Amino acid sequence: MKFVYKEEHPFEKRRSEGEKIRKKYPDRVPVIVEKAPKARIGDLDKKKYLVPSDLTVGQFYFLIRKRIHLRAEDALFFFVNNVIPPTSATMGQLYQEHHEEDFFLYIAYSDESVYGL
Amino acid sequence: DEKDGFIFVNYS
């Protein structure tokens, strides 16, 4: 799944930054969040987030929802590696399993239950 | 809230 952030920030610079930020704010997890191609819903203000390790995916839905001012009837789905993480994982667990060699975790969101329609 | 280029996401 293409990411703009990866496209325009060189790996080794993503890696030094991710290492620093883990070392500097350890009880939070660094997350890149970008709208899925062809998602019809709101675009996000910023894309770099430092998230409490013990926040649930579920709870993170509410926070992101509120940041893009979704309509009640709008849907929101998350995608890590083309796959939905279950609401019942922590962001910390998601980070452990799914972070990349640059120390970031990458999440795309959509109004479709499939990336990326 | 926003330091080091990251939104410090709080429980809220």
Side-chain angles (χ1 to χ4, degrees):
Chain A
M1 26 178 54
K2 208 219 85 199
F3 278 87
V4 185
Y5 187 93
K6 281 162 97 161
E7 294 294 347
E8 64 202 357
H9 301 80
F11 169 82
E12 195 42 66
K13 255 84 194 151
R14 297 192 321 263
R15 186 189 228 258
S16 10
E17 173 170 42
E19 180 188 14
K20 301 191 63 133
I21 282 275
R22 286 297 286 137
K23 293 205 226 247
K24 180 147 145 173
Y25 314 92
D27 287 352
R28 303 185 168 234
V29 140
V31 185
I32 306 299
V33 176
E34 294 191 33
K35 171 139 75 61
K38 271 127 208 155
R40 327 232 265 215
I41 54 170
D43 229 322
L44 259 169
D45 15 290
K46 319 264 321 307
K47 71 190 37 165
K48 276 134 62 92
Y49 293 84
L50 232 25
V51 279
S53 289
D54 64 326
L55 202 77
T56 58
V57 170
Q59 276 144 17
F60 193 60
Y61 271 111
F62 181 70
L63 305 156
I64 294 294
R65 166 165 297 257
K66 266 198 348 152
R67 283 199 88 91
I68 45 208
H69 300 89
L70 284 202
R71 294 197 74 68
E73 7 97 352
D74 284 335
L76 187 49
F77 298 94
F78 284 150
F79 300 93
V80 198
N81 295 332
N82 276 298
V83 159
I84 310 192
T87 60
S88 62
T90 47
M91 294 305 294
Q93 266 139 66
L94 212 44
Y95 183 89
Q96 287 186 19
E97 309 171 308
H98 299 306
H99 78 88
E100 298 196 1
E101 288 176 310
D102 68 7
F103 307 116
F104 290 91
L105 167 70
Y106 290 86
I107 294 177
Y109 67 95
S110 191
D111 52 349
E112 270 286 353
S113 59
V114 184
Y115 197 86
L117 324 168
Chain B
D1 176 78
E2 136 103 299
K3 63 198 138 139
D4 271 303
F6 286 83
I7 308 301
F8 271 68
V9 142
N10 254 40
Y11 307 96
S12 224

